[PDB]
């Protein structure tokens, strides 16, 4: 997260870290056994780390649980990042408490101008690299479809939206992928892609979670 703030320990209790000997993507806990992340974050043998703030220090509220299953959207395309969504099943159910909690799925799609909370442990610089120990947060609005398409001609599908600030300085970045975009208490987006980070006229692009609610529920039911 570039241009954000320190969230505060366990203030985003649905945020998870996907770890392979190091943090590489975020995710969102949607029930005690399932996490939503980005398809491009897929790798075998992931450890999900819940209840984190400082990802480099044991502070007492962590739960580390192996992924037992990974379900990438059947129509994911790595070339275009269309359908950039994955479901992860935990090997054992997380113990839900004040620091480890599920985020609700949408009942309808969000609109342009709605303020959302984007969070993660990704890069805090747009030039060079500076990675935080503690969770960072950013308030950002959803952009109009037309502004999103103008920013990224030919690359925005109906399963994506743009959020952020066209003047630059505030955005998600490498290491935030898979993490949440929450609007009015609903998980509306997944961090996906962008040109650079926090660059003028190049907002963040996010998977449009509302398109996938029936697929998510069907997948949880059958796995």
């Amino acid at each position: 997260i570039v241009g954000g703030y320190t969230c505060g320990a366990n203030t985003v209790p649905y945020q998870v870290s996907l770890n392979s000997g190091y943090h590489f993507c975020g995710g969102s806990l949607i029930n005690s056994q399932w996490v939503v992340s980005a398809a491009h974050c897929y790798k075998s043998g992931i450890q999900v780390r819940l209840g984190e703030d400082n990802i480099n220090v044991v502070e007492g509220n962590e739960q580390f649980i192996s992924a037992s299953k990974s379900i990438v959207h059947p129509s994911y395309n790595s070339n275009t990042l269309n359908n950039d969504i994955m479901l992860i099943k935990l090997k054992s159910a997380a113990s839900l408490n004040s620091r480890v909690a599920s985020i609700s799925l949408p009942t309808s799609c969000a609109s342009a101008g709605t303020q959302c909370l984007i969070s993660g442990w990704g890069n805090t610089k747009s030039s060079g690299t500076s990675y935080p120990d503690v969770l960072k947060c950013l308030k950002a609005p959803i952009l109009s479809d037309s502004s999103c398409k103008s920013a990224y001609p030919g690359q925005i599908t109906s399963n994506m939206f743009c959020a952020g600030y066209l003047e630059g300085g505030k955005d998600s970045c490498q290491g935030d992928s898979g993490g949440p975009v929450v609007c009015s208490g609903k998980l509306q987006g997944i961090v996906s892609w962008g040109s650079g980070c926090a660059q003028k006229n190049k907002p963040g692009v996010y998977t449009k979670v509302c398109n996938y609610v029936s697929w998510i529920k069907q997948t949880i039911a059958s796995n």
């Binding site: 491009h40 974050c41 990042l81 998600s172 996906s192």
Partner: peptide, 12 residues
């Protein structure tokens, strides 16, 4: 296209 995995999508 530039995905936002760490350290990068290509660096895997």
């Amino acid at each position: 296209i530039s995905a936002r995995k760490y350290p990068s999508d290509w660096e895997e």
